[PDB]
Swiss-Prot record, chain A:
One of its GO terms (molecular function) is mRNA binding. Required for bud-site selection and cell separation. Also involved in nucleolar processing of pre-18S ribosomal RNA. Keywords: Nucleus, Phosphoprotein, Repeat, Ribonucleoprotein, Ribosome biogenesis, rRNA processing, WD repeat. This is Periodic tryptophan protein 2. CDD domains: WD40. One of its GO terms (cellular component) is small-subunit processome. Present with 16700 molecules/cell in log phase SD medium. Interacts with snoRNA U3. Interacts with MPP10. Component of the ribosomal small subunit (SSU) processome composed of at least 40 protein subunits and snoRNA U3. It comes from the Eukaryota. It comes from Saccharomyces cerevisiae (strain ATCC 204508 / S288c) (Baker's yeast). WD repeats lie at residues 11-51, 52-92, 93-131, 143-182, 188-222, 236-275, 278-318, 321-360, 363-402, 406-448, 449-488, 491-530, 553-592, 626-664. Pfam families: ANAPC4_WD40, Utp12, WD40. The gene is PWP2.
UniProtKB/Swiss-Prot annotation, chain B:
It is found in: Cytoplasm. This is Small ribosomal subunit protein uS9A. The lineage of its organism: Eukaryota, Fungi, Dikarya, Ascomycota, Saccharomycotina. PROSITE patterns: RIBOSOMAL_S9. Belongs to the universal ribosomal protein uS9 family. The keyword Ubl conjugation applies. One of its GO terms (molecular function) is RNA binding. The modification Phosphothreonine is found at T68.
Swiss-Prot record, chain D:
Belongs to the MPP10 family. Involved in nucleolar processing of pre-18S ribosomal RNA. Required for the early cleavages at sites A0, A1 and A2 during 18S ribosomal pre-RNA processing. It is found in: Nucleus, Nucleolus. Component of a heterotrimeric complex containing IMP3, IMP4 and MPP10. Interacts with snoRNA U3. Component of the ribosomal small subunit (SSU) processome composed of at least 40 protein subunits and snoRNA U3. Interacts with the SSU processome subunits EMG1, IMP3, IMP4, KRR1, NOC4/UTP19, NOP1, RPS4A, RPS4B, RPS6A, RPS6B, RPS7A, RPS7B, RPS9A, RPS9B, RPS14A, RPS14B, UTP1-UTP18, UTP20-UTP22 and UTP25. The chain holds residues 446 to 495 of 593 of the full protein. This is U3 small nucleolar RNA-associated protein MPP10.
UniProtKB/Swiss-Prot annotation, chain E:
The WD repeats are grouped into two tandem seven-bladed beta-propeller regions. It comes from the Eukaryota. The lineage of its organism: Eukaryota, Fungi, Dikarya, Ascomycota, Saccharomycotina. WD repeats lie at residues 22-53, 63-93, 101-140, 150-183, 190-227, 234-269, 277-329, 336-370, 397-436, 445-479, 487-523, 528-563, 565-606, 608-646. InterPro entries: Quinoprotein_ADH-like_sf, SSU_processome_Utp21, WD40/YVTN_repeat-like_dom_sf, WD40_repeat_CS, WD40_repeat_dom_sf, WD40_rpt. This is U3 small nucleolar RNA-associated protein 21. It comes from Saccharomyces cerevisiae (strain ATCC 204508 / S288c) (Baker's yeast).
RNA sequence: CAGCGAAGGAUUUGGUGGAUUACUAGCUAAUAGCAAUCUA
């Protein structure tokens, strides 16, 4: 109900590290932040791992059994994780900045390259239990003079070939009893050698410099030892090589440069196959699937990645994100796709089922401040600092209207009538609320009454009164329509940020600047109550500030709140690293999440390390600025218990999985999952259904729901009592959205809201998030299936009933 | 030295200052006792901050209230606003902040004009 | 059985408060004499249009109940009555005098008929509010009317106006003051005894509505 | 960019065949996204 | 017993036990190998962090350990384990049943000695490998030759000799020929310590009377004697940085530093380690270092540094007294009560029978530090009561954490043994809080709890009253008086709506806040000794005295579960943080797990010592148990988080066992069923031409098709066809080789007919038909009324007609859903 | 003034030691030697 585990991180599809496919070409592991995302390609899904690193991660690898991965950040704090259970296994501190880690093809030894030493360790087991010190060191080799840059194995786990910013590149045998087989050292490049590869048989050794040279070492004669046979070249002029990989069996080299270009070759012939670019910023990491069909290219600075199928040139997914510019958020009114408005001025449109974008909108010049959706799903409005509130259709995926002021003032918040007929925007420097008709783009009016900038706006979703909140310490209620234009002011203690009104349209939550959040019934002007939200938001002391985190007052308040969709719980987020959620009847905190636990962001820690302080200046203001942590806008989803929060590392999305919980409902001694399964096998289906709901174990709900047969679903759907309808309606929604038994689900929905439609009709707000997931399910799988089956019907009818032979 | 707190309270032009400190439980308006406050029919309008929440919260503090300006009803609204937010500020600073927002909940559930005056008027229709 | 001990030293403060006041701190009564609970609007259709669920001390709340439309149907009925009672050209503004004379009024209402005067005045309102009237429609400028029904806000407002101006007109040139005149008018209206001005005008208006129905 | 990065509180970050155009609009595999009035 | 849910992990918070440690050098570093009961531990000596532990325990307890350069030689019941980096590298089984007592390492010959004066010495097979692996010989000291053994060592510059130190005599050996060489003189009392000197060939040896003899073994004499009154000596050492300093350690907790150049006491140290736990078990100088590493039996290791002298001219005569330097300790008695501080499972709190409170850190084991008993001064004028001498607090019984307002005011509450009040603490700045919450009815504190909003504290006295307090002033708020004997458990909800009291009378009282009435009373038929509220799921589990664990949900006040099956008093519970399990440990030396949905007992570990306290971590990964004995605190890792476990009532279908449930393929053939997997296969198949046209930069199947054609069923063809990639599906289906007969087209349309006859994957069969229609429907429209393809299309539509109930259903459901969500 | 109150009470401030990130030992020319030395 309120146990939001960290579900996904939308946005920022790659930032820093090395992309890695799984063994089977199904999942792509991307080093997103201090966490690791996993993109499942075929089952078009994704998740992010719940564990976090203390800085940005810089090395990923999982063994070829796909069972456990390790991930290493900037100071070597390696963390390994059961990949099939998504939990942490062991933390470790390699003492210096690692560069690349590689499990063996055997997967029993992994070696990594910390600084100039390489070190082979042997792995722990998923099957052997969680030991205290699981890492047993195999050996450590020190044959280099500068930092290692890359690392590879043989196809068997016998030799390991390393290459460094020292001009040489060397080879090693993993046991102490193959020292004569490989001990030598390959000099000869001009610049940083960063590629060193065995061939498919281990006899050819391809080495790749930084300035585009490729040598082919081969153990041939003038006993005789590793003669370079050929110096092939690249000849990209100002593009030194940035990242190399080489699939051995299909014999495919892939090189990304500084110029934002990549080329893939068939190497033993040295034939250029593909040469093409992704942008003006370098390809930071190539990696390649084991079956050679797919490649993956990550460019860090624009934050983009691209998996490319090179046999048939068809892009599996190409994506681009942001960083620390995620300025606002919206959901589609069916909770299926998300809109991210970002401060460079662009409107990304993500979706929740996958993790990918599907449409940017690169239209605005300066920043986009706030967005929200309107008019039955498929209009969304975006409001900028260009002086523009512009509409967007989300079916043709185009602009269609652009309202401006009369003088180019920057806009800061907007709202829109739910009956999508008027659009209201508020600024920092005009003290007014601009109202535009939207069916005709002309400026309707400008309505005033404040004397400070209007911080936030909203429209009531039912009675269409508008609620604005401004730094006059004042909230103001306008009734616009219907011959009146009647204003009503309400004073509050400090100045206001972050209005958000309840889905009933009966009251308003405001987030004042003193760390408090008030609630006002709007039929009166009466305050219902307020939550002192100040002493429970941990505000991190920065790196450069000379006051404590306690006496600091940078973020001891909130800047965006939102209700839940039953009108019962306010989620709130600010310029601090805490996003809290409260429940308004009891007026109490019920959970506080921290958004990030890495010191790469600025305001995370409230207690900084003392050893970094010097005689003058801290040791992190010495350059060789740092981005703050903020949560700019937070929303609950319409169709889940899940909620999203747009922070500097993109959208965090937390969610409920009621799978892992015991969250029962007035059970007693007799009712037992064994008792429900015996009640089902003696077939009293209504009793077994409520006997499963009282357990509230969703796999019992799944089992009883599937084992009820079709010929009495009207009977049990009639006899089901009133207090279980929200549970069964939302269960049918969130199971049917990814299920398969479509006719079964639709029989169940037809039975349910035929037998008990009126109760929903007089309890609309009880089922507002319930039967929105059902309508999402309807219009986003079943209507499409009906569309194609009707297209088949009509194309058959035409291709039979018409004739012609010429 | 001694723990004190000074708050204000304003109706139309009357202004009330309240010095609340730790004491023995005496409530004085210009030296007069709180019982001897005219116009004698809004003595309960003066009483309701110390009557809504019980005198046990007033047992340890003593309040002295100066008033200037305004007529009779403006002075009694200024007195009750000053008494109320002086008690709230004393409990915000020196004792339980939980008791602070208990008192704030009580006063706001009764009427918030006993905590925040409604200043910015009129309207040009 | 069970107890809850909140206070641990009795109320002995330095300015010695009156005992009836520190007895009124347990529960709010109007004028420290009349408890607002066990007072019900006996009628339906005026419940949540005569505010009695929110107790007050005196009838001089200084809230704002004229800026919005229906929010004058939420300030409590006693000071609704005294604000209508202040209305005449001789005595505008004098709502402290209005408060004290309705204090004397409902005090003698209790000492005559002792249930509680707030219940007396609430069911006086419910019995005095007219349930139909007419409207002087044009009809070619003839003697033309048509019966309509009355919304409960207009019912409550017209009941309060009828009671107050009936008390004034019956206390114009008599020995009785406006206090006891309003008292006897409210008692007759509470019984519905067809004697007082407001119940007479109510039955007359419903009579002409039924006639021109 | 340089004047409004120093006038702000929060941090601001700043031939072959194709640059691949990774930031594409209009894409739910749409070809005729024009309105019938616009045709 | 072995388990199946929890695996034991480590006994944290434990430093030493009383076995004499050893030290080893590596370059210019120093490591201290100390024993903790059964496993050992390797600290370093510079920053005194932990470095290593044994990877798995020993069979018996370790009796004696030593250390060469990389290797640690542990010694228990019959064996000696040669270890490297805390991993065992070689066992050495001794050729006896006698229990080993001491050992030494020198050159090649390892030498261990049992408890009957029998000395097994071992030898390295190659004078180049790393550790002595091969049995060389067995010397045996007889009672003619001396007393029973007390130490042995090879002091320096001796060609393959050895020195056995008995209780009455010193006796050398030549270990190559197995020969005795020099028995010493007679000694008139029992000696108990002998450590060599860094000067040539002498050994200092201290007796049970407080004298140190300095035997010169080359001379065979004694050189000097340090006399000390009635001190049971325990541990000698020498300082080797040039300035000669002997250091004796007396088992009365004394450490005396003698000069030797002028026979003077430099400085005494009194009560350095506790007397009763053994005193100074082992104290040594690090060689070439002016520091001292002491270790007692009282779970404490200390370092004492000698400062440079202040007399720059005199120098060695004026010696500054030893400072105190880094030290690592735990509490020295078994811990009474145990809590987890934060949700991150980083800090945990112990309070022990020796009346100390510690904050252990189970992340990094140098962060563990004692909380401090220094009272905040009364700033109203009062004087601190108690005593004048600063004794430690009385024994801690119960305590309660709520990290919600941490460090902003007082944080945690505690409840001491048989004292009338209950002081509070702070966890962020780690000392005693300002206030002492009092019971106001003379009953001792038995239950403490606090709200998860961190304001209200809750004292439950032995006379039944429950006084609630505020924790940012320390004043009282209200006194709930319902019970008539000792209240044993208090809790309050998450959202502070209802609170639950739990007495020894069997009364469980459901009160609510904000209206101080009660609203429920329950009577159980036993006295109640514990209550654990699961604040997430509103259940709370109670001990009883008929050994039940009664789980009551707080909303409808039902007794919702009753876990039977224990044999003695249940000392502890904890909810799993999901609320699925109750882990409960009880005085029949057992610790059982209850799956509270099924009400069953999943597994019961038979633990050797009775676990007093059992606590799950805020996150479900660690189970910390504390026992009757052992100075540490044993933390347990649940394997249930990494693999799913059974649910099966033990006593000394698989889907409902393993709590999971797979979804069946279709309910019956009468129902439609979409494809298993992605729902974007439909859109990618319908649009993959324009998908690749927008994403461009600026046969086996026919074999199976005629196979299934001649066998007249296409199920194997459809099983092939469904599950491969959209690109390959379209590239295959685009070319279907149909010029005159169109047999292949009729086979394909009949294949889709047989496919959507089954009512399964019918979205995929619809889009395959639509893919064929866009592919080469032109030839179907061209030679339409070809008899074969017209028959295939006719019975294809005759089976397609059954799929109109789907659009009837969804166009019902969408319209009525829109109507009930708008109007 | 009062009371609190076990052989003192209450403050100012320096230094050292332990934390402030998650505990796999040091050095070097590193499949080994060193830790008393890498020299012949």
């Amino acid at each position: 109900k309120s146990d939001f585990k960290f579900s996904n991180l939308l946005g920022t599809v790659y930032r820093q590290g090395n992309i890695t496919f799984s063994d089977d070409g199904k999942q792509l592991l991307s080093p997103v932040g201090n966490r690791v995302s996993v993109f499942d390609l075929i089952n078009n899904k994704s998740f992010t791992f719940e564990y976090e690193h203390r800085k940005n991660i810089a090395a990923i690898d999982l063994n070829k059994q796909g069972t456990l991965l390790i991930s290493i950040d900037e100071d070597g704090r390696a963390i390994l994780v059961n990949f099939k259970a998504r939990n942490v296994l062991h933390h470790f501190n390699f003492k210096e900045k690692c560069s690349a880690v590689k499990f063996s093809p055997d997967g029993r030894l992994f070696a990594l390259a910390s600084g100039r030493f390489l070190q082979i360790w042997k792995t722990p087991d998923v099957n052997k239990d969680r030991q205290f010190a699981p890492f047993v060191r195999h050996r450590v080799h020190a044959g280099h003079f500068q930092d290692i840059t890359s690392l590879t194995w043989s196809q068997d786990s016998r030799f390991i070939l390393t290459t460094s910013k020292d001009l040489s590149a060397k080879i090693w045998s993993v046991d102490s009893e193959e020292k004569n087989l490989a001990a030598t050292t390959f000099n000869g490049h001009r610049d940083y050698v960063m590629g060193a590869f065995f061939s498919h048989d281990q006899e050819k050794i391809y080495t790749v410099s930084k300035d585009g040279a490729v040598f082919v070492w081969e153990f041939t004669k003038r006993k005789y030892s590793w003669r370079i046979t050929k110096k092939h070249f690249f000849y990209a002029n100002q593009a030194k090589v940035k990242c190399v990989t080489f699939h051995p069996a299909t014999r495919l080299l892939a090189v990304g440069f500084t110029s934002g270009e990549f080329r893939l070759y068939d190497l033993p012939d040295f034939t250029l196959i593909q040469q093409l670019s992704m942008g003006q910023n370098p390809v930071n990491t190539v990696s390649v699937n084991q079956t050679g069909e797919w490649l993956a290219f990550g460019s860090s600075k624009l934050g983009q990645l691209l998996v490319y199928e090179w046999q048939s040139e068809s892009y599996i997914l190409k994506q681009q994100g942001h960083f620390d510019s995620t300025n606002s958020l919206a959901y589609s009114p069916d909770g299926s796709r998300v809109v991210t408005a970002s401060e460079d001025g662009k409107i990304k449109v993500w979706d929740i089922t996958s993790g990918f974008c599907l449409a940017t909108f690169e239209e605005h010049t300066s920043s986009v401040t706030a967005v929200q959706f309107a008019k039955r799903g498929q209009v969304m409005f975006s409001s900028s600092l260009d002086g523009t509130v512009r509409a967007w259709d989300l079916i043709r995926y185009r602009n269609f209207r652009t309202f401006t002021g009369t003088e180019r003032i920057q806009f800061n918040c907007l709202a829109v009538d739910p009956s999508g007929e008027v659009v209201c925007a508020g600024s920092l420097d005009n003290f007014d609320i601009h109202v535009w008709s939207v069916q005709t783009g002309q400026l309707l009016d400008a309505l005033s009454g404040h004397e400070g900038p209007v911080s936030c706006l909203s429209f009531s979703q039912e009675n269409s009164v508008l609620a604005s909140a401004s730094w006059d310490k004042t909230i103001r209620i306008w009734s616009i329509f219907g011959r009146s234009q009647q204003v009503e002011p309400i004073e509050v203690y400090s100045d206001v940020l972050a209005l958000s009104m309840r889905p009933d349209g009966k009251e308003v939550a405001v987030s004042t600047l003193k760390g408090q959040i008030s609630i006002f019934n709007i039929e009166d002007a009466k305050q219902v109550g307020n939550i002192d939200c100040r002493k429970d938001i941990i505000s991190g002391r920065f790196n450069q500030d000379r006051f404590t985190a306690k006496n600091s007052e940078r973020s001891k308040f909130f800047t965006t709140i939102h209700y839940s969709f039953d009108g019962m719980a306010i989620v709130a987020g600010g310029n601090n690293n805490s996003i809290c959620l409260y429940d308004v009847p009891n007026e109490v905190l019920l959970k506080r999440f921290i958004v990030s636990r890495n010191m790469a962001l600025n305001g995370t820690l409230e207690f900084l390390n003392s050893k970094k302080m010097t005689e003058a200046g801290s040791l992190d203001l010495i350059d060789d600025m740092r981005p703050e942590v903020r949560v700019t806008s937070v929303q609950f989803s319409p169709t889940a218990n899940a909620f999203a929060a747009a922070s500097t590392e993109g959208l965090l999305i937390y969610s409920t999985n009621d799978t892992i919980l015991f969250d029962p409902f007035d059970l007693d001694v007799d009712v037992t999952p064994h008792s429900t399964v015996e009640a089902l096998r003696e077939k009293q289906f209504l009793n077994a259904l409520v006997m499963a709901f009282r357990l509230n174990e969703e796999y019992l709900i799944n089992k009883v729901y599937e084992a009820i047969p079709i010929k009495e679903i009207p009977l049990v759907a009639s006899n089901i009592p009133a207090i279980y309808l929200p549970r069964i309606l939302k269960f049918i929604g969130d199971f049917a959205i990814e299920s398969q038994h479509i006719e079964f689900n639709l029989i169940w929905i037809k039975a349910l809201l035929s037998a008990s439609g009126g109760y929903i009709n007089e309890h609309k707000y009880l089922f507002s998030t319930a039967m929105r997931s059902i309508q999402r399910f309807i219009v986003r799988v079943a209507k499409e299936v009906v569309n194609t089956t009707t297209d088949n019907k009509y194309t058959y009818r035409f291709l039979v009933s018409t004739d012609g032979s010429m | 030295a001694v723990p004190s707190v000074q708050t204000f309270g304003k109706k139309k032009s009357a202004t009330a200052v309240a010095h609340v400190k730790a004491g023995k439980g005496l409530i004085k308006v210009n030296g007069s006792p709180i019982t001897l406050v005219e116009p004698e029919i809004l003595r309960f309008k003066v009483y309701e901050p110390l009557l809504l929440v019980g005198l046990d919260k007033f047992s340890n503090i003593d309040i002295r209230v100066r008033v200037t300006g305004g007529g009779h009803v403006s002075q009694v609204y200024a007195i009750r606003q000053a008494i109320a937010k002086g008690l709230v500020a004393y409990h915000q600073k020196y004792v339980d902040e939980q008791s602070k927002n208990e008192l704030k909940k009580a006063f706001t559930s009764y009427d918030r004009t006993l905590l925040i005056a409604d200043s910015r008027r009129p309207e040009p229709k | 059985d069970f107890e809850v001990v909140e206070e641990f030293t009795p109320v002995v403060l330095a300015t010695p408060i009156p005992e009836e006041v520190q007895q009124a701190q347990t529960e709010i009564k109007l004028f420290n004499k009349w408890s607002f609970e066990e007072v019900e609007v006996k009628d339906a259709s005026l419940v949540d249009y005569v505010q009695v669920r929110q107790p007050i001390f005196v009838a001089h709340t200084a809230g704002r109940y004229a800026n919005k439309r229906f929010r004058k149907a939420q300030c409590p009925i006693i000071e609704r009555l005294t604000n209508s009672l202040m209305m005449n050209g001789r005595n505008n503004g004098k709502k402290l005098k209005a408060v004290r004379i309705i204090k004397h009024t409902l005090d003698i209402i209790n000492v005559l008929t002792d249930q509680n005067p707030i219940q007396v005045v609430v069911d006086a309102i419910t019995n005095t509010g007219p349930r139909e009237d007419t409207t002087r429609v044009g009809g070619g400028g003839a003697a033309r009317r048509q019966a309509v029904d009355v919304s409960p806000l207009r019912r409550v407002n017209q009941a309060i106006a009828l009671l107050t101006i009936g008390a004034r007109e019956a206390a114009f040139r008599n020995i009785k003051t406006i206090a006891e005149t309003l008292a006897e008018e409210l008692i007759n209206a509470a019984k519905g005894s067809s004697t007082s001005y407001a119940i007479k005008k109510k039955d007359e208006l419903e009579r002409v509505a039924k006639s021109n129905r | 960019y340089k004047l409004d990065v120093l006038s702000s509180v929060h941090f601001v970050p700043k031939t072959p065949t194709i640059s691949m155009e990774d930031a594409q609009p209009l894409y739910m595999s749409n070809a005729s996204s024009l309105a019938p009035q616009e045709i | 017993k072995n388990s199946k849910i929890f695996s034991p992990f480590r006994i944290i918070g434990n430093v030493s036990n009383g076995v004499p440690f050893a030290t080893g050098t590596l370059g210019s570093t120093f490591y201290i190998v100390t024993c903790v009961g059964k496993t050992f531990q390797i600290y370093d000596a510079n920053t005194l962090h932990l470095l290593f532990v044994s990877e798995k325990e020993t069979p018996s307890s370790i009796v004696a350990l030593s250390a060469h350069f990389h290797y640690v030689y542990a010694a228990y019941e019959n064996k000696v384990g040669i270890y490297k980096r805390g991993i065992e590298e070689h066992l050495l089984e001794l050729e006896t049943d006698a229990n080993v007592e001491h050992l030494c390492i020198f050159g090649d010959y390892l030498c261990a000695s049992t408890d009957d004066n029998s000395i097994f010495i071992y030898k390295k097979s190659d004078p180049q490998d790393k550790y002595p692996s091969e049995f060389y010989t067995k010397l045996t000291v007889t009672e003619i030759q001396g007393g029973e053994i007390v130490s042995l060592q090879h002091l320096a510059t001796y060609l393959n000799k050895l020195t056995v130190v008995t209780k009455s005599n010193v006796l050398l050996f030549n270990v190559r020929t197995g020969k005795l060489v020099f028995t010493s003189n007679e000694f008139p009392d029992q000696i108990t310590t002998a450590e060599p000197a860094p000067v040539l060939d002498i050994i200092a040896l201290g007796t049970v009377t407080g004298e140190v003899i300095m035997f010169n073994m080359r001379k065979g004499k004694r050189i000097r004697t340090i006399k000390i009154p009635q001190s049971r000596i325990s541990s000698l050492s020498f300082r080797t940085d040039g300035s000669s300093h002997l250091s004796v350690g007396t088992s009365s907790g004394d450490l005396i530093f003698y000069d030797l150049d002028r026979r003077s006491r430099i400085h005494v140290l009194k009560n350095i380690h506790r007397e009763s736990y053994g005193g100074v078990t082992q104290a040594t100088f690090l060689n070439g270092q002016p520091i001292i590493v002491t270790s007692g039996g009282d779970n404490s290791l200390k370092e004492y540094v000698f400062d440079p002298s202040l007399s720059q001219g005199s120098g060695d005569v004026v010696v500054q007294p030893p400072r105190y330097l880094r030290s690592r300790g735990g509490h020295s008695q078994p811990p009474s009560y145990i809590a987890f501080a934060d949700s991150q499972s980083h800090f945990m709190l112990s309070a022990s029978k020796d009346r100390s409170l510690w904050s252990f850190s189970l992340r990094k084991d140098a962060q563990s530090q004692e909380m401090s008993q220094r009272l905040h001064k009364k700033q109203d004028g009062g004087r601190v009561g108690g005593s004048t001498i600063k004794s430690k607090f009385p024994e801690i019984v119960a305590l309660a954490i709520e990290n919600a307002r941490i460090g902003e005011w007082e944080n945690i509450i505690t409840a001491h043994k048989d004292e009338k009040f209950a002081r509070t603490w702070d966890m962020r700045n780690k000392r005693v809080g300002r206030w002492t919450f009092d019971t106001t009815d003379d009953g001792f504190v038995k239950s403490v709890a606090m709200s998860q909003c961190g304001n209200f504290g809750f004292i439950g006295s032995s006379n039944g009253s429950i006084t609630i307090y505020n924790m940012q002033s320390g004043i009282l708020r209200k006194k709930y008086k319902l019970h008539k004997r000792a209240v044993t458990g208090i809790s309050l909800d998450g959202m502070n709506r209802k609170m639950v009291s739990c007495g020894l009378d069997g009364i469980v009282g459901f009160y609510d806040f904000n209206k101080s009435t009660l609203l429920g009373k329950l009577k159980l038929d036993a006295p109640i000794t514990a209550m654990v509220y699961h604040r997430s799921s509103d259940l709370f589990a109670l001990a009883l005295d008929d050994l039940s664990i009664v789980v009551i949900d707080a909303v409808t006040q039902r007794v919702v579960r009753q876990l039977w099956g224990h044999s003695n008093r249940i000392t502890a519970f904890d909810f799993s943080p999901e609320g699925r399990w109750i882990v409960s440990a009880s005085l029949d030396s057992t610790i059982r797990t209850w799956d509270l949905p099924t009400g069953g007992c999943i597994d019961g570990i038979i633990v050797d010592n009775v676990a007093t306290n059992v606590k799950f971590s805020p996150n479900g990964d660690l189970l910390a148990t504390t026992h009757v004995t052992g100075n540490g605190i044993c933390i347990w890792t649940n394997r249930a988080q990494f693999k799913t476990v059974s649910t099966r009532t033990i006593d000394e279908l698989n889907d409902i066992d393993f709590n999971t449930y797979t979804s069946l393929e279709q309910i019956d053939k009468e129902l439609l069923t979409l494809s298993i997997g992605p729902r974007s296969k439909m859109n990618t198949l319908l649009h993959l031409d324009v998908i690749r046209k927008r994403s461009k930069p600026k046969s086996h199947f026919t074999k199976q098709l005629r196979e299934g054609s001649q066998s007249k069923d296409y199920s194997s063809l459809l099983a092939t066809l469904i599950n491969f990639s959209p690109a390959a599906v379209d590239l295959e289906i685009r070319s279907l080789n149909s010029f005159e007969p169109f047999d292949e087209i009729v086979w394909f349309i009949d294949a889709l007919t047989q496919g959507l006859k089954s009512n399964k994957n019918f979205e995929l069969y619809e889009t395959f038909m639509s893919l064929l229609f866009k592919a080469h429907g032109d030839v179907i429209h061209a030679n339409n009324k070809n008899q074969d393809i017209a028959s295939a299309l006719q019975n294809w539509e005759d089976v397609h007609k059954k799929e109109d109930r789907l659009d009837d259903l969804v166009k019902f459901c969408m319209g009525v859903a829109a109507f009930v969500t708008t109007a």
